[PDB]
Each structure stands twice: as C-alpha cells, then as structure tokens.
Design an enzyme around this catalytic site. Structure first.
Site, PDB file in Angstrom:
ATOM      1  CB  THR A  62      60.250 -46.271 110.308  1.00 18.77           C
ATOM      2  OG1 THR A  62      59.420 -46.871 109.552  1.00 18.77           O
ATOM      3  CG2 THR A  62      60.351 -46.427 111.898  1.00 18.77           C
ATOM      4  CE  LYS A  76      62.070 -48.619 107.910  1.00 25.10           C
ATOM      5  NZ  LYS A  76      61.383 -49.246 108.342  1.00 25.10           N
ATOM      6  CG  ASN A 115      63.294 -49.450 104.415  1.00 23.98           C
ATOM      7  OD1 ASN A 115      62.983 -50.467 104.638  1.00 23.98           O
ATOM      8  ND2 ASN A 115      61.860 -49.003 104.491  1.00 23.98           N
ATOM      9  CG  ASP A 146      59.759 -51.241 102.695  1.00 19.22           C
ATOM     10  OD1 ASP A 146      58.755 -51.414 102.429  1.00 19.22           O
ATOM     11  OD2 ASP A 146      59.835 -51.449 104.452  1.00 19.22           O
ATOM     12  CG  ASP A 180      59.574 -46.824 106.369  1.00 20.44           C
ATOM     13  OD1 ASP A 180      59.752 -46.488 106.641  1.00 20.44           O
ATOM     14  OD2 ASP A 180      59.328 -48.281 105.576  1.00 20.44           O
TER      15      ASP A 180
HETATM   16  N1  LIG Z   1      67.062 -55.987  97.202  1.00 24.59           N
HETATM   17  C1  LIG Z   1      67.535 -55.992  98.393  1.00 24.59           C
HETATM   18  N2  LIG Z   1      68.568 -56.921  98.184  1.00 24.59           N
HETATM   19  C2  LIG Z   1      69.015 -57.070  99.729  1.00 24.59           C
HETATM   20  N3  LIG Z   1      68.714 -57.038 101.248  1.00 24.59           N
HETATM   21  C3  LIG Z   1      67.299 -56.188 101.120  1.00 24.59           C
HETATM   22  C4  LIG Z   1      65.942 -55.983  99.263  1.00 24.59           C
HETATM   23  N4  LIG Z   1      65.768 -55.424 100.461  1.00 24.59           N
HETATM   24  C5  LIG Z   1      65.225 -55.691 101.172  1.00 24.59           C
HETATM   25  N5  LIG Z   1      66.217 -55.942 101.934  1.00 24.59           N
HETATM   26  C6  LIG Z   1      66.175 -56.646 103.006  1.00 24.59           C
HETATM   27  O1  LIG Z   1      65.221 -57.050 103.531  1.00 24.59           O
HETATM   28  C7  LIG Z   1      65.024 -56.309 104.662  1.00 24.59           C
HETATM   29  C8  LIG Z   1      63.199 -56.104 104.591  1.00 24.59           C
HETATM   30  O2  LIG Z   1      62.738 -56.175 103.418  1.00 24.59           O
HETATM   31  P1  LIG Z   1      61.404 -54.626 103.655  1.00 24.59           P
HETATM   32  O3  LIG Z   1      61.508 -54.507 102.267  1.00 24.59           O
HETATM   33  O4  LIG Z   1      61.913 -53.349 104.515  1.00 24.59           O
HETATM   34  O5  LIG Z   1      60.525 -55.101 103.874  1.00 24.59           O
HETATM   35  P2  LIG Z   1      59.330 -54.717 105.190  1.00 24.59           P
HETATM   36  O6  LIG Z   1      58.164 -56.076 105.532  1.00 24.59           O
HETATM   37  O7  LIG Z   1      58.760 -53.407 103.650  1.00 24.59           O
HETATM   38  N6  LIG Z   1      59.864 -53.829 106.100  1.00 24.59           N
HETATM   39  P3  LIG Z   1      59.374 -52.862 107.761  1.00 24.59           P
HETATM   40  O8  LIG Z   1      58.175 -52.505 106.404  1.00 24.59           O
HETATM   41  O9  LIG Z   1      60.201 -50.993 107.319  1.00 24.59           O
HETATM   42  O10 LIG Z   1      59.201 -52.494 108.324  1.00 24.59           O
HETATM   43  C9  LIG Z   1      65.403 -55.052 104.172  1.00 24.59           C
HETATM   44  O11 LIG Z   1      65.390 -53.829 106.124  1.00 24.59           O
HETATM   45  C10 LIG Z   1      67.431 -55.664 103.749  1.00 24.59           C
HETATM   46  O12 LIG Z   1      67.540 -55.404 105.206  1.00 24.59           O
HETATM   47 MN   LIG Z   2      57.804 -51.636 104.368  1.00 23.86          MN
HETATM   48 MN   LIG Z   3      61.714 -51.913 105.381  1.00 25.36          MN
END
Ligand SMILES: Nc1ncnc2c1ncn2[C@@H]1O[C@H](COP(=O)(O)OP(=O)(O)NP(=O)(O)O)[C@@H](O)[C@H]1O
Ligand SMILES: [Mn+2]
Ligand SMILES: [Mn+2]
Lengths: 149, 343
Positions: B194, B161, B164, B177, B159
C-alpha cells in the site's frame, strides 16, 4: 479514507534500443532528471533506460492518453502543444496547457492505475515514451546481478 | 532482557514443520456457497468483497472473501491469489485470522475466515485520532511476534496497514489480507503493498526481503502514535519521493524512545534497519520503547487490552462501515478453470 493496495506485474529475474541522436539523448536525459524513478538509477541503468524510450509522433487533435484508461507508458514532451483536462463528476475542466515541454504518466512506471487525465495534442508534436514492463525488466535484471547480504 | 523472557527456539522449529506440512497439502472445496447465508458486506476490494456470512448447519458466523476469477486474471494477480489461500490455510498464530473453509465455482474463489467483529484498527484509529504510546505499543508487540513467526517460515507479509488489522472481541489484533504474502528464501521483486507503507527498496525495484515488513511496522507505529503516516502527500509520487528521502519529522509529543525506535525501523538503508541486523527481531524486543513489554503475556493474550470494541452479539457489524450490497451471481460456464486448479 481507507487505502487500497497497489500491485505491479511480477518478474523474478533470479528465476530494446531505439536509435537517438546525441542531441536527442541529452535533451531526454535532461527532461527526466527530476523524475523520481530516474534520479535513483545507476548511470548504466540510465543509459539502458534511455535506449529503451521510443518516439511517439502525434497529430493535432490526437489523444495521447484518455482518462480512465489503463496506464502502461510514461511520456516526456519533445515538441508540440498539448491540452490537459479532467472530468470530475461529469464536469469536464481544463487544467492547463503544455507548451513544448513537460512530462506525464510517471506513476505508470510503477503499476497500472487509471489515467487521471486526458492529454490531447493541440498541434503536431513528438514525445518519448517508456513502457512499465520494459523499464522494470531493465532495472530488475540489472539489480539482480548485484550481490547482497 | 526482553528477548530473554520467552524461549521460542523449539516453538519456531515445530511451527516450521507444521507449516511446511500444511503448505504442501491444502484442502480444496471444503464447503460450498449454498451452505452459507450472506448477511452483509464488511469491506470491498479490487477482486470483490468480504461478506459476513452464517454457516447454515452450525449457525456460526464467518467472513467470506469473494474473488472474481476473471478480475484476478485481468489484474494479473493469479499467483498472488493462489499464494494468499495456500499460505493462510497453512499458518497458525494467535494474531493471524484463521481460514475455516475455501471453495470455488464457475465464477469466483471463496475464502471463509473466522469473523473478527471488532472492525478495522483503521476505523478506531481515525475515530480516536491517535493512540497513546502504551496503546500503540500493545498492538506493536503483537505485530513484532507475528512477524517473528512469519519470517521464521521464510514468509513475507507485505501489506501491513491499519485497514488489514482487525480488532477481536478481546481487543487483540487479527491480521487479515494475505493477498501479497509469499514464501521467499532470498529476495523478491514484485512492487506491491500500500503506497504509504512501501519501503524504499520496493519502490525502487532494488530487490527486497523481510526487512520491508519491519519498515512497514515503523510506518504503522508512527501512524498509530501520530494519527497520520510519516510519509504523506495528496499524490502517490509525492508520497514515494518522501519515502525514498526517508527524512521523517516526529510530533513533539513522541517520547525519545519512540523516536529512536522509529529511526531504526524507518531506516532507508535496509542493512541498518532493525529486524534485519545480526540479532534480528531481538533488537526490537530489546529496544527501550518495549522495556515494559511482557512478551509472554502478549503471546498468551493475558495482557489487558487498552481498548475493546462494543459488541451486541453474533452478526453485529456496527464496527464496520456500510457498503453497497449486491447479489452474488455465478455463471453457467466455468471461468478461468486452468489457472486456478490448485485453489
Ligand atoms: N476475517 C475477517 N473478519 C472481518 N472482517 C474482515 C475479515 N477479513 C477481512 N475483513 C474486512 O474486509 C476488508 C477487505 O478484506 P481484504 O482482504 O483486506 O480485501 P483486499 O481486496 O485484499 N483489500 P486490499 O488489498 O488491502 O486493497 C478488510 O479491510 C476488513 O475490513
Ligand atoms: Mn489485499
Ligand atoms: Mn486489505
């Protein structure tokens, strides 16, 4: 805008025939010739996929798919008229009329996402449907037998 | 030459040993909800969101990803979610976000990661428009090393992008992520990732391997240098049609070396794609576009970052967009216990 991830159902192969007349099969194949996931299938896969597509009879006024619902099926029109409308911010609008030909729900063959529109039959009709999971199992099981490296 | 700068043979061997040991021994409930003060949402996702939190005893700030168990089950992401936590807790690399704690309650799963205050590369890229090739190269080099590491552990990230990739206080990348990360020794089949970054083999269910990560890198480099991805359309199917065709158009300002690198990463035939040939990652480390890259300085994070986000202090979330907040409610009845025991 930030792009969300997409994800379909898993199926690790390494770890279904709906009778149709020759005429029906030919017309159906001709209607999926331009469909991305079909164009990329090997001849044997195509044959197996076409066998898996089921007939969906609909009555006038019947909703084939409702916007926002989970999508697991792809549909190709065989006959009948259908309407297509999309609700935007609460405003319902017609985006055209189907006339005995056409296809929709293509994305459902890859993963589930809410239907982008409602498609209602405006007269007696018939469609051919394909379930995402059934499709995937066919392609993956067939490709799993292919040697790699 | 690029590949001859740093010797990573024994490093990858030990890293593998350490990973396997940790992968088989994840910790459970190393913290609890009431030990953190929820400050603000940093981003939202399908199962919930990631919030900036403060550990009440230490005062340190962290990013807590909350996953609604019932939602995970409904979206059929149980296996992926278990893999996400088990793998993230087991890896260790300069460019991978660290998982500090994890726990679960009647309603959700919680992953407490180190907080990366710099924000998503996505926001900076959209604001700046497009990065210079040297700037894009700086980030690319970090990803190249990270994939070399992950792939050596027989893991696939799946993933990549800008959304992430977080920017830390030194301007370096922190990959977050691990939602789709998976241990794969041969090939896997889940259609996930994605849209704009999916490799052709994923879209077509042909079965795939780590080569999809290298394809994604090609998409990332292109997007960083152009300001938009190589395969774009207002509808997903059109995006996929373009990806499968592979026909790519390069901006006139792209250097000859960049175009060559991208033609080899965005190779529709995975068997001819850079990162998946006999020399593996070395083909990339040795490409002319990376000629001026000091891989050692990158790994040791000694290279001067071309860009550093602004920071006020701990808790600063100015680099992240605002999101609608909501109190975290925990049910009085345990939900989906059986399915998440390993977590
Ligand atoms: N360690 C971190 N520190 C700061 N911000 C974070 C961190 N981890 C995640 N984020 C923020 O939170 C968002 C969401 O986390 P993410 O793990 O990408 O959710 P997700 O549901 O897996 N998104 P996706 O699967 O790509 O549709 C990220 O895109 C960052 O903006
Ligand atoms: Mn994700
Ligand atoms: Mn994500």
């Amino acid at each position: 805008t930030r792009r969300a991830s997409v994800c379909a159902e898993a199926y690790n192969p390494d770890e279904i025939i709906h009778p149709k007349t020759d005429d029906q099969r030919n017309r159906l194949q001709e209607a999926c010739k331009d469909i991305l996931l079909f164009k990329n299938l090997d001849p044997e896969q195509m044959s197996q996929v076409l066998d898996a597509m089921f007939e969906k009879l609909v009555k006038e006024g019947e909703h084939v798919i409702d916007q926002g619902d989970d999508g697991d099926n792809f549909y190709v029109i065989d006959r009948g008229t259908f309407d297509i409308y999309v609700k935007c911010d609460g405003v319902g609008r017609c985006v055209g009329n189907y006339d005995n030909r056409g296809s929709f729900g293509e994305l459902a063959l890859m993963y589930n996402t809410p239907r982008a529109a409602t498609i209602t039959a405006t007269s007696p009709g018939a469609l051919w449907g394909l379930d995402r999971v059934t499709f995937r199992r066919i392609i993956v099981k067939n490709n799993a037998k292919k040697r790699k490296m | 030459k690029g590949s001859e700068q740093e010797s990573v043979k024994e490093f990858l061997a030990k890293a593998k040993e350490d990973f396997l040991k940790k992968w088989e021994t994840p910790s459970q409930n190393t913290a609890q909800l009431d030990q953190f003060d929820r400050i603000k949402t940093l981003g939202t996702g399908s199962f919930g969101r990631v919030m900036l939190v403060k550990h009440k005893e230490s005062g340190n700030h962290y990013a807590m990803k909350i996953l609604d168990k019932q939602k995970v089950v409904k979206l059929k992401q149980i296996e992926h979610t278990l893999n996400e936590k088990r793998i993230l807790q087991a890896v260790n690399f300069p460019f991978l976000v660290k998982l500090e704690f994890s726990f679960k309650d009647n309603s959700n799963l919680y992953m407490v990661m180190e907080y990366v205050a710099g924000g998503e590369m996505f926001s900076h890229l959209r604001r700046i428009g497009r990065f210079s090739e040297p700037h894009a190269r700086f980030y690319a080099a970090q990803i190249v090393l990270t994939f070399e590491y992950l792939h050596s552990l027989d893991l696939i990230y799946r993933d990549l992008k800008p959304e992430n990739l977080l920017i830390d206080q030194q301007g370096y990348i922190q990959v977050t992520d691990f939602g789709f990360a998976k241990r794969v020794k041969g090939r896997t089949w889940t259609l996930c990732g994605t849209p704009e970054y999916l490799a052709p083999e994923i879209i077509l269910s042909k079965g795939y391997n780590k080569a999809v990560d290298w394809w994604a890198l090609g998409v990332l480099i292109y997007e960083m240098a152009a300001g938009y991805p190589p395969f774009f359309a207002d509808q997903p199917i059109q995006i996929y049609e373009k990806i499968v065709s592979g026909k790519v158009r390069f901006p006139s300002h792209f250097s000859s070396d960049l175009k060559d690198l991208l033609r080899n990463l965005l190779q529709v035939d995975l068997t001819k794609r850079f990162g998946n040939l006999k020399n593996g990652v070395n083909d990339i480390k040795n490409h002319k576009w990376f000629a001026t890259t000091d891989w050692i300085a990158i790994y040791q994070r000694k290279v001067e970052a071309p860009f550093i986000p602004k920071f006020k202090g701990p808790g600063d979330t100015s680099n992240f967009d605002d999101y609608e907040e909501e109190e975290i409610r925990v049910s009085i009845n345990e939900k989906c216990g059986k399915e998440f025991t390993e977590f």
